[PDB]
């Protein structure tokens, strides 16, 4: 009815301990979602153009041109880590768990409130918020995944991370195909390169509408909604990082001269001269056996062009990389291609009392040492004469194509049948939890955005929209915008997300890295005197595991 | 900022200045988020010699 609630708030996290070291983690989230009525009931096809910015020669990387269908619906997206876990729960998970399985997800909407704003014509303006006991909220669940998948975490548009702060949904839109060509240039390039928006290819047009593709429930103030329980099939994630690179794989060389005194400079010596040694190498014409030349079972990580932009039907896009940079842990200023950089606002981690439009940003320096250090790379001739002469070695200090600032590493690629790499580690709080596998015939090995990728399917996107509340003067043959009573809605969204984890075992003598509250970061996990709150980022793969 | 009249010359605009925007990028040393630099799940197609 009207005065009877249709659900209960719940934001607790439960750890149910099972047999054989497994833990059933139940993350409950509950939010108060506020939704204004849409700008216009009509779907729009909007072409966004930034031809002004790109026209400046050498600025092609800043292309934003595209075409998108903008819809009257709003998306309720909970695909982010911060929605489910507070820093303490994440601390427990990372410090104690070794692997994380995604099990199930269900969500529901209850306690729907619809209100109308009546503004008086009094000389001093005033407005009063009445209820509307008959207005409806349209809720559509795309259980069949008939609509384009649009994860909001990539735009920091998921629900809030604070249970006590109301959150808003995101207006839904999806890309409409377009043809666009942009020939790159540089500062000082003469003339105007070909920079053109070509329209649309009819063979690719796709105009989706929620009304035609999904059943839409109408929820009055006394109604409820529940999506039911979906079950994932994603592969297990590891909360452990690998440190062994190719140089640390296998049996080290026996030391014939061990050190005899403590001290940093009292090194040990192998003894056998490098050309008189034993072992196996992939160098069929060289007698030298060294740690750099000795055969290894396979290659850890791979090299790829960094900051490479490739163009296609829709224009240029950065080539993604599956691993971070090398040595970034020693110097953050060297954090570069491959280390995801998250920007977010006051709903998703930034201090809630901050003023201004500037967002809060952080670069994630993954622990795993699967990355590369392109400055230490080099190529040398097949003859392998040592020391290598100038003409027989290509170095990162060598110009390629006549450019002083570009070297061979910028275009080098070593992905091969021997390559081995790890999945992207979870990013708290702003990291995405799951993502949809592509419908291509050959599917990518991993996604750079989510640790869980969806083999068959995973939960349909949930859409909400304030049903139109017409005035008596409605005339559908009028070309003007529909006349609607100012109406908004507030409804409680509750979700339950179920993981399964294994509790880690101490394999080694020494202790391992752990997350701990300390004097330097103490105040990031408590409110300020004026209620300000922030959710700083936390690393997720502290414990090390042996690669080989 | 949505368009207000029909015709090609009436585009839409994202509004937020590019270096003040929000999102996830694989470019750890720049604040610019554009449709060319924003993170995507994976790569469709590939270049070959």
């Amino acid at each position, epitope marked *: 009815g009207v005065g009877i609630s249709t659900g209960t708030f719940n934001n607790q996290t439960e750890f149910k301990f099972l047999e054989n070291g497994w833990v059933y983690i139940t993350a409950n989230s509950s939010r108060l979602v506020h939704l204004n009525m849409p700008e216009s009931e009509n779907y729009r096809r909007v072409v966004v153009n930034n031809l*002004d*910015k790109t026209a*400046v020669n050498g600025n092609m990387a*800043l292309d934003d041109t595209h075409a998108e269908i903008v819809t009257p619906w709003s998306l309720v997206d909970a695909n982010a880590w911060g929605v489910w876990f507070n820093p303490g729960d994440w601390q427990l998970i990372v410090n104690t768990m070794s692997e994380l399985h995604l099990v199930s997800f269900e969500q529901e909407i209850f306690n729907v409130v619809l209100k109308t704003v009546s503004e008086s014509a009094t000389q001093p303006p005033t407005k009063v918020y009445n209820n509307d006991l008959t207005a409806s909220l349209m809720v559509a669940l795309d259980s069949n995944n008939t609509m384009p998948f649009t994860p909001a975490a990539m735009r920091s548009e998921t629900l809030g991370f604070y249970p006590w702060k109301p959150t808003i949904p995101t207006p839904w839109r999806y890309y409409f195909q377009w043809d666009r060509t942009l020939i790159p240039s540089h500062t000082g390039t003469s003339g*105007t390169p070909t*920079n*053109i928006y070509h329209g649309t290819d009819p063979d690719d047009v796709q105009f989706y509408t929620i009304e035609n593709s999904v059943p839409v429930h109408l929820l009055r103030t006394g109604d409820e909604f529940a999506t039911g329980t979906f079950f994932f099939d994603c592969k297990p994630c590891r909360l452990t990082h690998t440190w062994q690179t190719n140089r640390a794989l296998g049996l080290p060389p026996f030391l014939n001269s061990l050190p005899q005194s403590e001290g940093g400079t009292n090194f040990g010596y192998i003894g056998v001269q490098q050309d008189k040694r034993r072992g196996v190498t992939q160098m069929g014409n060289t007698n030298y056996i060294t740690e750099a030349t000795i055969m290894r079972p396979a290659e850890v990580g791979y090299s790829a062009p960094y900051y490479s932009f490739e163009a296609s039907t829709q224009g240029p896009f950065k080539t993604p990389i599956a691993a971070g940079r090398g040595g970034a842990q020693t110097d953050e200023n060297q954090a570069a291609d491959g280390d995801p950089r998250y920007a977010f606002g006051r709903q998703h981690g930034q201090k809630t009392t901050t003023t201004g439009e500037t967002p809060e940003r952080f670069t994630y320096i993954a622990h795993q040492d699967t990355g590369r250090y392109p400055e230490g790379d080099w190529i040398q001739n097949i003859n392998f004469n040592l020391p290598v002469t100038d003409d027989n070695v290509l170095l990162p200090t060598d110009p390629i194509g006549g450019k002083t600032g570009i070297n061979y590493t910028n275009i080098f690629n070593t992905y091969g049948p021997l390559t081995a790499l790890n999945n992207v580690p979870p990013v708290y709080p702003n990291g995405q939890i799951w993502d949809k596998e592509f419908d291509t015939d050959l599917k990518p090995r991993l996604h750079v955005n989510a640790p869980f990728v969806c083999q068959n399917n995973c939960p349909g996107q949930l859409f909400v929209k304030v049903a139109p509340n017409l005035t008596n003067q409605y005339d559908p043959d009028a070309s003007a915008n529909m006349s609607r009573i100012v109406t908004y809605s507030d409804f409680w969204w509750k979700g339950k997300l179920v993981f399964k984890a294994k509790l880690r075992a101490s394999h080694t003598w020494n202790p391992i890295q752990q997350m701990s509250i300390n004097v330097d970061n103490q105040f990031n996990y408590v409110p300020s005197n004026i209620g300000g709150m922030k959710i700083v980022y936390e690393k997720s793969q502290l414990a090390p595991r042996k690669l080989y | 900022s949505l368009p207000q009249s029909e015709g*090609g*010359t009436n585009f839409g*605009y994202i509004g937020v200045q590019q270096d003040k925007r929000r999102g996830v990028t694989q470019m750890g040393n720049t604040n610019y988020i554009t449709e060319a630099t924003i993170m995507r799940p994976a790569e469709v197609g590939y270049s070959a010699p």
Partner: antibody
Amino acid sequence: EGQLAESGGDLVKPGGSLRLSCVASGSTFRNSHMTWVRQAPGKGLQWVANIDSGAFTTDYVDAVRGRFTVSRDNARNTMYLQMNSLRAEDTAVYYCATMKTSYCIDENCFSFQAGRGVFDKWGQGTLVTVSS
Amino acid sequence: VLTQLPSVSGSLGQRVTISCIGSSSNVGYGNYVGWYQQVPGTSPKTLIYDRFSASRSGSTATLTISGLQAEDEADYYCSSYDTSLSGIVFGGGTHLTVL
């Protein structure tokens, strides 16, 4: 629709400095390439300078190179022209205008391409003179 | 500086052409061309971004005006972008006398 509005033009002593302003109305200023042009009385239209939307690059004519400095403020939604080292030749009416960055191919504009050399909208203008 | 005619004249209701005869790497090259109208004391108005028409016409652009009236008895300017200067350039302007 919104329009531009110039201000700051006036007689000033030769060799001095001044600062012309061009207020912009409408949401397109942040997105538009801005330009300054000047017209000496009964003379031909003379380009002064241009600056892109993001203040990434600036261009001037040799006649004002090293003397004029164009700048913009999206927070104030305005453009400015610092006319340092004023010279007798600066006496003219100065306008601020918008350079058309996109030109549509089809007459209904289903396809667009970048270009330069056409000014879309013009401001009111301000008169500047250089004399003692 | 682009070469533009000093002036042209014609009676009411007739058709006239005002030509811009700049060189290559300039208005007479793949770059765009723009025409503006102005009466002394008024800001120029951009004609071609309805009775008017225009054509780059290879190395020499032309604006075909028609329906000459008391209004439009004004000055007309040609503009383009020059690569040798890498900047916007203008023609000398042309005046129209309507008889």
